[PDB]
Design a binder for this molecule. Structure first.
Ligand SMILES: [Mg+2]
Ligand SMILES: [Mg+2]
Ligand SMILES: [Mg+2]
Lengths: 49, 49
């Protein structure tokens, strides 16, 4: 969203004027982070941990 | 079928190699064994047996 502004000093019976929210955007591009580990079956079985 | 073999001493994490059951045949080829005998009608009549 656009930064906040201030409402306007207005006469009685006078038109309420427009200062609408103007918009922009920021892009995301999510990078894949990966880590693996390999263990032998013998190691997986024998570990105390 | 092929003969039994001995399983292979292997490292950990190493590929288990293929030595699958292997097959052959022995082909039979049945050979016609034949035997003939001929006798005349006079021989057949005159013989005691
Ligand atoms: Mg007007
Ligand atoms: Mg403005
Ligand atoms: Mg073999």
């Amino acid at each position: 969203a656009s930064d906040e502004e201030f409402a306007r000093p207005t006469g009685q019976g006078a038109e309420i004027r427009d200062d609408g929210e103007t918009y922009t955007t920021v892009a995301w591009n999510a990078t894949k982070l990966t880590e693996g580990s390999r263990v032998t079956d013998e190691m997986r079985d024998q570990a105390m941990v």
